[PDB]
Amino acid sequence: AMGSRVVILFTDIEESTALNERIGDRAWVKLISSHDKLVSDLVRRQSGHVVESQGDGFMVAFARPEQAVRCGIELQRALRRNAIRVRIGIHMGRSVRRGDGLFGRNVAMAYRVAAQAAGGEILVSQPVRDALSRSDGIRFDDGREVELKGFSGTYRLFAVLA
Amino acid sequence: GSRVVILFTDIEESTALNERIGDRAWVKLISSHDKLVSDLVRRQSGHVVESQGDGFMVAFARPEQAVRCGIELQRALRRNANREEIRVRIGIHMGRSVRRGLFGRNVAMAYRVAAQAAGGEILVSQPVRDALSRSDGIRFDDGREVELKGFSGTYRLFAVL
């Protein structure tokens, strides 16, 4: 349908509710605020754009898939340095721009991919894994077929290595 | 944070719906839905805080405003279904949440109530139920104990009849 091709990145903090209940709102608000600041800096460093700031994570838009992945790699490296565990999913395709937001099935797919990822892991769809086959120095695993809610059939998702 | 009533909406199987009608038709629907929700919220002096994908987070000062909004919304959706069909979950919780540019365990709690609700159903937390136990036009069931993700123990959620 309508829209231009874009790379969509979704973050998703693992077990944020349990963490919130554990440290309390005061400590939680301070933590997520610093987290928001961290993600914001890294996204800008890869020419990305934070589209929406959900309660647990963010939706981010990039022009190039390599920008999105590299942002993910740097984000995971920074979080481990501070050690919160975060899931990262990356998908690309056409998406409908409405206002300053993004809508469509590929937006849903993007989060779906992120939801399959483990804490501290970066997962990507096959189109992203294909667009980036021969790119130094980004390496993927062998992939795995998974069923995703709302979509028929199966989809192969790939994790970023190192 | 300050006291506030949080209402969450959540469309049932929106992804499958998106795939069935296509992005073009999908944007028409959610846009139309966005206006319907927003107008009813405003009528109850509520304010739409966020629109995370297929749902909305709404803040009310008083609990009766949130429930009355939920009832009118579910009545409106049913009226649209009889005349694409869309089922929506509604969860309502009240508690203190910090305002940043809303955040807090009570924001998460509010969503959790909505997620437990069936399509076309309105679920409310115990505090909301107690505040409106004798409200006009509002009646609740006997409620049911449930386990909520991230929260220890169990919580009793009441449905608006």
Ligand SMILES: Nc1ncnc2c1ncn2[C@@H]1O[C@H](COP(=O)(O)OP(=O)(O)OP(=O)(O)O)[C@@H](O)[C@H]1O
């Ligand atoms: N279906 C949904 N639609 C919109 N927002 C959601 C949805 N599910 C969760 N959220 C947002 O994310 C928050 C809850 O996070 P979530 O459901 O991811 O659980 P969590 O505690 O972080 O654990 P985990 O991610 O490990 O499952 C909610 O407060 C809500 O704001």
Ligand SMILES: Nc1ncnc2c1ncn2[C@@H]1O[C@H](COP(=O)(O)OP(=O)(O)OP(=O)(O)O)[C@@H](O)[C@H]1O
């Ligand atoms: N944990 C979460 N944090 C933030 N946003 C979420 C979360 N879970 C879901 N969402 C948002 O909700 C949208 C659809 O999610 P959802 O799981 O509600 O799909 P669905 O097809 O409506 O399934 P269901 O019928 O179970 O609601 C996604 O595109 C995403 O933007």
Ligand SMILES: [Ca+2]
């Ligand atoms: Ca989460």
Ligand SMILES: [Ca+2]
């Ligand atoms: Ca939904």
